[PDB]
Amino acid sequence: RRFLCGVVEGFYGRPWVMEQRKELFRRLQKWELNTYLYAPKDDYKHRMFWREMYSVEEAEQLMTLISAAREYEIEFIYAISPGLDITFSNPKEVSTLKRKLDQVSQFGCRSFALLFDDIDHNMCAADKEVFSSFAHAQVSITNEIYQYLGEPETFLFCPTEYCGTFCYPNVSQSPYLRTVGEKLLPGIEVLWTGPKVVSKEIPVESIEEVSKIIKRAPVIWDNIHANDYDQKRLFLGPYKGRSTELIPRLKGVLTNPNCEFEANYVAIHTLATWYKSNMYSPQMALKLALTEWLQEFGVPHQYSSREQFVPGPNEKPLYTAEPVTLEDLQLLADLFYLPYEHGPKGAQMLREFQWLRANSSVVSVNCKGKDSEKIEEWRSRAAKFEEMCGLVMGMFTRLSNCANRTILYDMYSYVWDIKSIMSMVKSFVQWLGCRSHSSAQFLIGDQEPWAFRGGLAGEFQRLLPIDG
Amino acid sequence: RRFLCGVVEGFYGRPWVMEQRKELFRRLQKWELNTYLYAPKDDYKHRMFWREMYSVEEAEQLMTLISAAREYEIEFIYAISPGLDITFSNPKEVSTLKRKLDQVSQFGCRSFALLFDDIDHNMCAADKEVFSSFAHAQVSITNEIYQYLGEPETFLFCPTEYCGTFCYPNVSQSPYLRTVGEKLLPGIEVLWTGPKVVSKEIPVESIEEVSKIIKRAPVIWDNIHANDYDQKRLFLGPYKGRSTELIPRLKGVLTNPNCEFEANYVAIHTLATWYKSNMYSPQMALKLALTEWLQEFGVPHQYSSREQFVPGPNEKPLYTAEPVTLEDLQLLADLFYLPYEHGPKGAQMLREFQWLRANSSVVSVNCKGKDSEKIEEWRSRAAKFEEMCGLVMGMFTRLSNCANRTILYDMYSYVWDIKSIMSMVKSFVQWLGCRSHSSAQFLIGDQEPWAFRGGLAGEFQRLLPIDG
């Protein structure tokens, strides 16, 4: 039995380059994965201008990538998304799609996919006179393409209603999915993403409900680590929340990685472990992933003596950089954990800070003669919070000195922002702790840099509704 | 009389590459600027490991860069910041610095600078037994280095107190500045940044006060567009707040650009205009800068129809991209304008949104039976806000289609975040406007996604007290 496991390059943003993709292939082979799907959202010749043909230089790029994929025995799937403006009743459109796919095949590509995600539900007047339904036209054109291509072993189709939230009135009773299942040829595999676009968890019953319609096992398009619906968020947590009992009931798992190329080591490693387990413990998987990931940070750059000055007792020490530790990586993971939850350490820090803020007025000003136990407890908790903030700042400082700065420079902004905000919060906590003998306003320097926050974004965020 | 005017690469983060620097040189020659200072913070052979010698490949890159600068007649100044760990009473340190500067000189470099910014104020026991003061040691080593190099025409020195807020107890009475001014050789220029590290405006009298101490006209290191103290901020607004009367009283103006290479175009252009006026109106300077900048966006990519399909009356229209226009760039500028103020249009949008939020109760619940004038006013203002949000979204959509995508790709994240938050605000405003007849929760999809806006950094930011 064959099974699909791999990655889908289908995020919005600056697309990855050839070197990154080759390194990705090497990692995929190391981790015993087998599938790469190429459907970048911002490739003009993929979605927006699919009708155009590739040039000689683009042809060389594609041929090099496909040959590299063949070297590492990783299946390469090329996708097309003509749903933006294709007319189904015009033979010229079908011929153009056939010619495009033939140009792709000429390079040596083997597997092809057609996507109709994120388009409208309407058709032109011409198609109304031919097809009874939108699904009818989609299925007819997909079947024609599949027959033309020679019935390859692998072929992927994404229904417009790729999630339950987009099915009306429900998954079981949707006429679109019923028509698809009735009229789609048996040789095509169907993509699905779960109850929601970003599914927090996937119960088996929903997958069975989908199977009862599509008459085949689906292929999971998991956006558990996608970050193109709010690009301020980075996700480094392990693959979590999907039950392994789905493995016999699925044709394959394909993961959407983070837009930043070097931030997807942990997610892909955890996915590989998750699949390999049952041909599972999210905490153990994360621990193993970080243990393996630490090896690629190397050592911090150090002065190389490979006649050198050596200081004495009265001379300033030479600058030295500490190595990056496992604890730093764990803390970094907890700071950027999951789309629907934080890590244990980040959540605990947030709760502790909220508690400290809540009871600041208990002992802040002129608290002599009050309960000493409250004063000591508040001071101790504040000190522990200070230690946590110092740990975060030290993590950033140590990561800054890594010799292999490629890892950091692809995620520099997020870590720098989180360490800056931790520093600001530490200053705020100190000012709260000094109220009884200092009446000065909370200030960093002589002013309030936090008032500006993130400019317009932050000022608009400040006005959004909250639970409290 | 020679005058220094140009750019300093002295921000933290991922450093610029050779291609970007060459393009910068071409632009500088076009805009009639004459100075480039090279002191990237995160260059390991610049600051943290200054004692090491450049390798052959690095030497070739430096020679190519210097020759390119020679082609464009742009003065190139190379800086070193040995103050991190250098010992002043040990001749080995001085010899190493001399050898390093001589290696730099053999590449063809002509101008050199020594920086002692962002260091400690303490001294080792070895130096305290020799020099009377910290400033004494700094000035002595700088003077010896200056005399060894052959007294170049241009030489820059950055004191440790580079801003008024770092002067103790004040500017005029600072012993450090007095000692530096007395003991520094007359042939060296002195960097200064104004009252604060990020000075909002520069009163004329402050410069005269500083000159009364340093006994020489300073060279301005302006961080008006620096964004490495909170890297969520992007600054695209014009050069503002610096009176032209400073020009006769200054020896040069050097700007710190944004970390993103392509985001500084407007800034640099404005600076040139500000200089070229008095060898000034911020509004006109910005208009000219954006008019010149628009030419680099070219035209959006379009279908190439050089047997070509042409749709009929009842066929779905082809995907067509609209060009990027002046209004889109002005709106973008106002969205990311200045450290201490927003653009007029963004500030007005924020004020209008705040007013609408404040007066939600006028029509939120059971609006029928209430005063008509208030209802009409609130609805009209809401409609105008909706139109402005739509303008923002159209700006993002049109910017996404540029053929020369690089201009967008270096600042993709900021525009993407602002357009996402504008969309969320539009949805929230609609929900507020439809409450009288729709009692459903103000949800997006089935949830409130802004509960995870900004992740842990956003959550920590949200709890910082402000006056407004």
From Swiss-Prot, chains A, B:
Modification comment: Proteolytically cleaved by caspase-3 during apoptosis. The fragments interact with each other; cleavage does not decrease enzyme activity.
Residues of the full protein shown: 58 to 697 of 916
Enzyme class: hydrolase
Effect upon mutating residue 12 to S: Strongly reduces affinity for glycopeptide substrates. Nearly abolishes enzyme activity
Catalysed reaction, written as an equation: 3-O-(N-acetyl-beta-D-glucosaminyl)-L-seryl-[protein] + H2O = N-acetyl-D-glucosamine + L-seryl-[protein]; 3-O-(N-acetyl-beta-D-glucosaminyl)-L-threonyl-[protein] + H2O = L-threonyl-[protein] + N-acetyl-D-glucosamine
UniProt GO cellular component terms: cytosol; membrane; nucleus
Tissue specificity of this protein: Ubiquitous. Shows highest expression in the brain, placenta and pancreas.
Keyword set, alphabetical order: Cytoplasm, Glycosidase, Host-virus interaction, Hydrolase, Nucleus, Phosphoprotein
Keyword Membrane: no
Subunit description: Monomer. Interacts with CLOCK. (Microbial infection) Interacts with human T-cell leukemia virus 1/HTLV-1 protein Tax; this interaction increases Tax interacting partner CREB1 O-GlcNAcylation.
Effect of residue 118 to A: Nearly abolishes enzyme activity
Active site per the UniProt annotation: 118
Effect of residue 12 to K/Q: Strongly reduces affinity for glycopeptide substrates. Nearly abolishes enzyme activity
Name of this protein: Protein O-GlcNAcase
Ranges of residues in domain GH84: 3-279
Positions contributing to a protein binding: 10, 41, 117-118, 162, 228, 256
GO biological process: glycoprotein catabolic process; glycoprotein metabolic process; N-acetylglucosamine metabolic process; protein deglycosylation; protein O-linked glycosylation
Highest rank taxon of the organism: Eukaryota
Family indicated by similarity: Belongs to the glycosyl hydrolase 84 family.
Enzyme Commission no: 3.2.1.169
pH effects: Optimum pH is 5.7-7.
Activity control note: Inhibited by N-acetylglucosamine and not N-acetylgalactosamine.
GO molecular function, one term: identical protein binding
Transcription recorded as keyword: no
